[PDB]
Amino acid sequence: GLTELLQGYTVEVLRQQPPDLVDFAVEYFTRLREARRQESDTFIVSPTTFHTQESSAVPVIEEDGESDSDSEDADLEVPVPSKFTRRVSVCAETFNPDEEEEDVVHPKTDEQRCRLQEACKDILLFKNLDQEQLSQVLDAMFEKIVKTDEHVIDQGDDGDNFYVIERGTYDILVTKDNQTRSVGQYDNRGSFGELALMYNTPRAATIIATSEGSLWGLDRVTFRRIIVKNNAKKRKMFESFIESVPLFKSLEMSERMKIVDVIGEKIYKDGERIIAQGEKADSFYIIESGEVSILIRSKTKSNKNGGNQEVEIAHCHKGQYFGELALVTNKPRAASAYAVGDVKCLVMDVQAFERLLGPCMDIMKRNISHYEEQLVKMFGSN
Amino acid sequence: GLTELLQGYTVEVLRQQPPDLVDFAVEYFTRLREARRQESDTFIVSPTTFHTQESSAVPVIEEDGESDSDSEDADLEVPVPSKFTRRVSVCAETFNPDEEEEDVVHPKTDEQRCRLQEACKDILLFKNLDQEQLSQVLDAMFEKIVKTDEHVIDQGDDGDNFYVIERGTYDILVTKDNQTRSVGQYDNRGSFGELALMYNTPRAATIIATSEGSLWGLDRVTFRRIIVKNNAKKRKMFESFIESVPLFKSLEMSERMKIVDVIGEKIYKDGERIIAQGEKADSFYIIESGEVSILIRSKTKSNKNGGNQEVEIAHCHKGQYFGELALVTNKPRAASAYAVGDVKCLVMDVQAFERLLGPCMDIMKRNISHYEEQLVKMFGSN
Amino acid sequence: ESVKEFLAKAKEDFLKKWETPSQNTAQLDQFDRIKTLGTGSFGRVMLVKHKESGNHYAMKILDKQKVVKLKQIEHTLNEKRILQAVNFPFLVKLEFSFKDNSNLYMVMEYVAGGEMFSHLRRIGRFSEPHARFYAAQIVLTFEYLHSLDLIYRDLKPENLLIDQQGYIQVTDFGFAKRVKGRTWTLCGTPEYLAPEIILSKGYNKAVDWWALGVLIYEMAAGYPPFFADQPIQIYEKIVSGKVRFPSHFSSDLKDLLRNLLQVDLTKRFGNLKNGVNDIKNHKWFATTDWIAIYQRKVEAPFIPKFEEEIRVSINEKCGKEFTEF
Amino acid sequence: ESVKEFLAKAKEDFLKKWETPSQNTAQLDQFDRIKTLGTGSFGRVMLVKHKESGNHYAMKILDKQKVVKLKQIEHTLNEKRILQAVNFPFLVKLEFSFKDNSNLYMVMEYVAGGEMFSHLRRIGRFSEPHARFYAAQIVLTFEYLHSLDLIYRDLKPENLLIDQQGYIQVTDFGFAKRVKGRTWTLCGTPEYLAPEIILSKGYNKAVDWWALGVLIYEMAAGYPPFFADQPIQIYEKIVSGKVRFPSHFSSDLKDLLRNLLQVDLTKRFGNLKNGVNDIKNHKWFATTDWIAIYQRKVEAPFIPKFEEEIRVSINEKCGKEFTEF
Amino acid sequence: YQPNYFLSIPITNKKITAGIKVLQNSILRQDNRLTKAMVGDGSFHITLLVMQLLNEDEVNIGTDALLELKPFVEEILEGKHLTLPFHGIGTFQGQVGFVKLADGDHVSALLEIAETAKRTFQEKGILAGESRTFKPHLTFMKLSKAPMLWKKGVRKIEPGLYEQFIDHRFGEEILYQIDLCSMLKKKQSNGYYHCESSIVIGEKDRKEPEDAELVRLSKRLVENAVLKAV
Secondary structure: OHHHHHHHHHHHHHHHOOOOHHHHHHHHHHHHHHHOOOOOOOOOOOOOOOOOOOOOOOOOOOOOOOOOOOOOOOOOOOOOOOOOOOOOOEEOOOOOOOOOOOOOOOOOOHHHHHHHHHHHOOOHHHHOOOHHHHHHHHHHOEEEEEOOOOEEEOOOOEOOEEEEEEEOEEEEEEEEOOEEEEEEEEEOOOEEOHHHHOOOOEOOOEEEEOOOEEEEEEEHHHHHHHHHHHHHHHHHHHHHHHHOOHHHOOOOHHHHHHHHHHOEEEEEOOOOEEEOOOOOOOEEEEEEEEEEEEEEOOOOOOOOOOOOOOEEEEEEEOOOEEOHHHHOOOOOOOOEEEEEEEEEEEEEEHHHHHHHHOOHHHHHHHOHHHHHHHHHHHHOOO | OHHHHHHHHHHHHHHHOOOOHHHHHHHHHHHHHHHOOOOOOOOOOOOOOOOOOOOOOOOOOOOOOOOOOOOOOOOOOOOOOOOOOOOOOEEOOOOOOOOOOOOOOOOOOHHHHHHHHHHHOOOHHHHOOOHHHHHHHHHHOEEEEEOOOOEEEOOOOEOOEEEEEEEOEEEEEEEEOOEEEEEEEEEOOOEEOHHHHOOOOEOOOEEEEOOOEEEEEEEHHHHHHHHHHHHHHHHHHHHHHHHOOHHHOOOOHHHHHHHHHHOEEEEEOOOOEEEOOOOOOOEEEEEEEEEEEEEEOOOOOOOOOOOOOOEEEEEEEOOOEEOHHHHOOOOOOOOEEEEEEEEEEEEEEHHHHHHHHOOHHHHHHHOHHHHHHHHHHHHOOO | OHHHHHHHHHHHHHHHHHOOOOOOOOOHHHEOOOOOOOOOOOOEEEEEEEOOOOOEEEEEEOOOOOOOOOOOOHHHHHHHHHHHHOOOOOEOOEEEEEOOOOOOEEEEEOOOOEEHHHHHHHHOOOOHHHHHHHHHHHHHHHHHHHHOOEEOOOOOHHHEEEOOOOOEEEOOOOOOEEOOOOEOOOEEOHHHOOHHHHOOOOEOOHHHHHHHHHHHHHHHHOOOOOOOOOHHHHHHHHHHOOOOOOOOOOHHHHHHHHHHOOOOOOOOOOOOOOOOHHHHOOHHHOOOOHHHHHOOOOOOOOOOOOOOOOOOOOOOOHHHOOOOO | OHHHHHHHHHHHHHHHHHOOOOOOOOOHHHEOOOOOOOOOOOOEEEEEEEOOOOOEEEEEEOOOOOOOOOOOOHHHHHHHHHHHHOOOOOEOOEEEEEOOOOOOEEEEEOOOOEEHHHHHHHHOOOOHHHHHHHHHHHHHHHHHHHHOOEEOOOOOHHHEEEOOOOOEEEOOOOOOEEOOOOEOOOEEOHHHOOHHHHOOOOEOOHHHHHHHHHHHHHHHHOOOOOOOOOHHHHHHHHHHOOOOOOOOOOHHHHHHHHHHOOOOOOOOOOOOOOOOHHHHOOHHHOOOOHHHHHOOOOOOOOOOOOOOOOOOOOOOOHHHOOOOO | OOOOEEEEEEOOOHHHHHHHHHHHHHHHHHOHHHHHHEOOOOOOEEEEEEEOOOOHHHHHHHHHHHHHHHHHHHHHHOOOOOEEEEEEEEEEOOOEEEEEEOOOHHHHHHHHHHHHHHHHHHOOOOOEOOOOOOOOEEEEEEHHHOOHHHHOOOOOOOHHHHHHHOOOEEEEEEOOEEEEEEOOOOOOOOOOOEEEEEEEOOOOOOOOOOOOOOOOHHHHHHHHHHHHHO
C-alpha cells in the first residue's frame, strides 16, 4: 500500500495546488485516518450465575430445649426404720454422807415461807420430810426474778432446779413431735421441775413468763446434800441410843441398822400420857430427851380393892428405856407412863422388831455370861 | 519539493516498517511541521566611534564689556592764584542831606518791633545807631509775605533790600563755579543782605522759602535817607549850641565842625550827679535841655573845718555850659553838679579839644578886644 | 450346811483379792482383734481373740484420759476392783486387766448369746416356771454378793444376758459397791428404784431384793409393776407401794411378790430375820432345786441364737492417779 | 613861609577859574586821531595828536546823550569844572575842553608811562624808602587840594599813574568834590573807605588822610590793612580800627600808620590842630625833602616802560542843559 | 549513405519485451499474414547512432570509439541514471510500427549522448550519424520485412489493429549497456543482433560504490508514485 498511499496524496496535491505541502500532508493524512470506521460504544453488562447442588448428608446433630428448676427438692427419707427399746441407768451426783465438818443465806418473810410450805405439801420429795429438814430446805431456796417474756425453763434443756412461783403469770408449752401447744397457764401459783431434784434429765416442757414475776428456786445438789446429811446424822444419833441400851449389846452392827431404818420418833408435851396401864403392849421406848414418870394404880395387888390412886414406880431420863416387857411377854401394860416435861422418845414396834431380829429372849442369851444379869434386869426387883 | 518531501517519509517507512502507513504519515508530517526553528530575534546595542583626531592651535581671543559705572567726586582746582585783582569803585545814590521840607507807614506790634530790634543788635550799620534813628528805621521796614518754594533773593541779582525773617523756614544756597551747594537753613530766625544797604551789588547767595513765611524788608535808599537826614539835623543842632557859646565865638566854621564830629551827648534823670567835686576835670558840658544845679561843700574855705553841707553856687539852663575850667586849668573840680529835672548835655573831652584846636587860652585871645572880657568870665566873680 | 462352807470359802477368796487387787495381768500383744461391737453412746468395746489358747473375749477400751470427765472416775476404778475380786457362775468375768499410756483395758469373758431384754420383749412374757428358773439364778447371785457386802443396784432385763447354755449371766457393775452400813447415791433404773433410794433415807442390801420383786413381776407380766409414761408418776406409785397383779398370776406368785415389793422394811423378804431363806423357802420356789440351778444342771427353757485400729501414746499419761488398777 | 605864598596864590588862581569855568576851549579839527585805548566797561577814550604843536593827548569821548542814564550826570559836569580850575604837578591835566552836538570831549594830558597797580602787584611790595617817595607826593597833593576845599575820595593804586619821570600823576576825579562843611555820599573803593563814610556820620577832608594810611600800608606790605574776601568783613574790620602790621615794618612807619588809620577823629593825623604838618614832620618822613619832591628833582626809584571813526549829529542835542561846560 | 552498423541500447526490461510480444500477437490474431512484418523475439533495441564499418580495421576502430565513448556518457548523466519510459504506439507513414519513447528530461540527455557518439566516431574516421532529426523509438514491425504484403493488398499498418495499446505503459529501461551491432550479419541464438563489442555505462551505476544501502530506492518509489498520479 506504500505506492498507492503516495499516489493518492500526489493526486490531491496536483488538484488543489497547496502552497504548503507539509501543512497539506498533515491535513490529508489526518483526514484519511478519520474516514476509517467505526468507534463503538461499550455494551451494557449484566452478571448472572446459575448453580446446581446434589449432595445428600446422612449425619446431623440435633439438640433442643433447656432445663430450669423453680425450687430445691427435699431429699428422700431413708427406707430403713429404726426402733429403740433401752433405758439408761440414772444417777445423781455422789456425796460423802458423813458430815465433812460444818463449813446458803436467802432471806424470807413469814408469809413467804409459810406460802412455800403450802406449795410444797404434796410434792413427794417434800411430803414426808421432818420439821427441821423442811426448814433447812426452804432456807436454801434462792429467789429468781423474771421479766415478762423470759423463759424460765425450755423443753429439752438440762434441769438442775425446782421452782415455786412467788409472783407473776406464766404460759406452759409442750412440743410433741413437730407441734407445740400452749397447754396451760400459771397465775401467781404453782411449782414445776420436781424431777430435777432427783437427777439430771431433760426439761419436758417450756415455761415463759407473761409479766414481771418472782420464783423461788432450789438446786438439786443443795437439796440432796441437805437431806442426806441430815438423815445420816439422824442415823448416827439413833445408832448411839440403841448401842448404849445394854439389852441390845449382843446385837451386831447390821442388826442395829435394821432397827435404825424403821424406828420411830415422837414428841410429848409435859404431863401427857405415853403409855396407859391396861392397854396392849406393842412397843418399847428409848428416851432421847426429857424425863418419864412411871405410875401404877395399886389395886392389881391382892383380891379386889385398895389404893386406887397413883404411885410412881420408876422415873426415867435421857438414854433410858421403858415398856421393855412388851419384848418378852404378852400381858397388858402393868403401869402408865407420863412425860415429865418435854419428851422425845424412839418408839419401836415389838412385832417389827421380832420379824427383823427374831425374839428378844434369844438376843439376851446370845452372850451367855450376861444372860442371868439380863434376866434379873427384865424380871427383877428394881 | 514534492519528491524530496515524500522521500524523507518513505525512507523512514522503509527503515521502521510501521504497521500502519497513514498513522505513520500523520506523525511524520506533524513532527516535520513542528520541526522548523527558523524564527529568530536580534537586539543590537553597539558603540561606534572615531579613534583619532589632530589638533591645531588657534590665535583668536575673546573680550567682554563691563557694566557702566557713574561716579561724582567733589573737585577743587585753583588756576594761577594771583592776589592781583584790580578793585572797582562803589557809589551809593546821592542825596541832599540838608532837610528838603517834611514831605513810610508799616504797622508793627510791640513784640514784632521788639524782635526786630533784637535781630538787628549786631548788624554794624545798626549796631551803634541812636534810639530815634533805630525807631524811624524800624518804622520804615515793610512786610513781605512769601509762599513756600519762592525765591527771596537769587545769587547774582542786584540787591536793594535787607531782610529780617518774621516767620517761615528757608534754605540758603551758594553757587561756586559750576557747583551749587545747599549750605544752610533758617528756621524762623535770621537776616541777610546787609550789604545792599550800602550800595548796589550782586547778591552772593540764593534764599528760598520752604514754607509760608514773612520777612521784614528795608530798602537802601529809604535807610540811607533816614540816617543821613537825621545826622545832618543833629549836626546843625550841635553846631548851634557851640555857636551860641561866647567862649567859642572866635572859632572858625571848620573848627566848630571838628567839635561837632566828635562831641558826645548824655541824658541825666532829675537829681543824678553829673560832676562830682574833687574828681579830675576832663571835660565840659553844654546844656541843650533842662537845668543843672552847681553845689559846693563849704570846707575848702580856710584852714580845716566848717559848713560841710551843700551850697548852690550857680544854676544853669538850656544853652549854658559848666565845667569850663577844665579847659584852662588842671585842678580837681571845685564843685559838684546835679541834674535839675531831665537833662541833656553835650559832653566834650578837654584833651580831644586841645588835640583838635589847640589850648583854649589861645582861642580866647584870638579876638583881642574881647580877651579881657573872656578872662573875667572864666576866672571872675560871678 | 455346805451353804455356809461355800460362803466362808467365798469370803476368804474375796477378801484376799479385794485387799490385793490383781493389777495389770496380761499383755496386749497376746490378744489380736476381730469385730468391733462396742459403740452405743459410751465406751469402746471390741471383740478379740487369744494367742496360745486362742479364746474369745470382750475387751472394754477405756482411754486413761477419756476419764476425768463424764460423771465419775471412781465408779469405775472401784468397778474394776470388784469384778476382779468376785467369782460366781452367773456373773460375768474380768479375765484380764492391763494399762499403760493406753491404760485400762478390761478383758471380759465372752458368751455368744442373747440379751434378756430382747427375748422377754419378743415373746411378751415368760411362763411362771420359766420365770422361776431365771429368778432362782438371781437369788443365788444376790446371796453370794451380799455375803461379800456388795450391792448390785442395777437389776433389770437390760443388764442380763442369756448364755449359750441358756443360763443367766449378769453384766455391768457400774453401780456395784461394797457397803457395810448404809450408802446414799440415788442410782439405778427408774422402773426398778426402791422407795428408800427415791427418798434418800439411806440403804443397803434391801434394794436388791426390791428390784428382784420388780424383775420377777415384769418377767411374768411383760411389764414392770410401777409403770407410767412420766418418771414422776413412776416414783409416786413406787412410794405408795400399791400394786395390781394380772389375772393370770398364781397365788404363790402374788404372795411372794407382795413380800418383795414391801415399802415397809420390817416386812420385806430378804431383809428379815432369815434373810434370803424367806425367799428360798417360799411356796413359789418349792419346785426349785437350788443346788441344781447352781451347778447349771437344770435344762434352761430357751437356748439363744448363736471398726478401726487405735494405738497408744508411746507414753503413759493419767498413770499419776490410776495407779491402783 | 613860601608854603603860605604858594597856597595863597594857588587859591587865587583856583577861585578865578572856579567862578568862571573855561568852557569849550579848543576846536576838534586841531586834533587828529591815533590809537583807541579807552574801552574797559565805560566811556570812550582814544589817543590823539595835535596840529601846530603836534602833541599827544588823551581825549575822553562823552556822548552828550550817553549821559542822563548811568549813575549820575553831575559827578561829571562837576568833575569837569574841577579839573579845569586846578593846577598841580602830581595831578593830571585837562588840556582842552569842547562840545557841540558831539558834546563833551575831554582833552587830558598824556604820559606814556605805567600804572601804579601793575607795578606794585608785580614786585609785591615797595621798600619803605620807595614807598615814602610816592607818599610824599600824595601828601603834597592833598595839602594843595584841601587848600581849595576839594576832597579826592578815591585814593588807590588803581588811580595812580607813574609818568616817564618816575613821579606820580593822579587820575580819575569821579568823586572829587568841593566841600566846605560836611558831605555824605557813600563812595570810594571798599578797601579804602573811612569809618565815617561807611556809617554815614558826615565827613570832609579827614577821609583822604585815612585813605593815605591805607595806601601807604599797602605799598609797604603788598596788601591793604583791612583785607577780606567778603565786603562786609572788610567794613567791620575798618570800623573796629584794629590793625596788624607785618614783621618787617619799621617803628616809625607803624607809628605813622597808627595815626593815619585812627577811627577816632580827635587823634587822626591831618585832622588835628597842625593839619598836614603832623604828617610832614613825622619821623618816618624825616629824610624827605618836600621842596625837592615838589620840583620833581629827586630821583625816582623806578622808570616805567615806554578802533573806529565816530561822527557828530550835525545838530546839537542835550545842549539844553550841558550849557555850563 | 546506407549504414551497416549501429550503436544499440538493448531492451533488457522483460516487462517491456513481454508487453510488445502481446501487442504483436494481438495484431497477428486479427491478421495472421502480418507474421513476417513483426520484428523477431530478442531483437528489441533503440538505435542510438548509425554508421558504416566497411572492413576489419574499421570494425576494430568502431570498437575503439565505443570504448572511448564510455566516460563521455558518464560525464553527461552527471550521476543520475537515464530512464527511458516506453508508452503508446506510433507509425512512420503506416509502414513502420513502434512503441513511443515518452516525453521528458531523458529525451534531451539521450539526444546529447547520440550527438557525442556521432562526434566520437567521426573523430576516429568513421562515417556515422545522419542529417535528419534524432527521433528514438522502439520498432515492433516493418512492412518492408514482408515484401509479399504489397503483392497481396496490405500496404499500410491498420491503426485499428493496435488500438487497445494506444496508451499502454510497456515499461521503463535504464541505460546501462550500449552494444556495437552489425545490421547484416547473422543474428545471435537469442534473436539479438550480432554484437562486435559492448560497453556498460553503469558504475554500475552508482555515485558511491558502497551500498547506501537501498536508501535511494525511496527515491525510485516516490518518483514512480508521482508519475502514476499524473
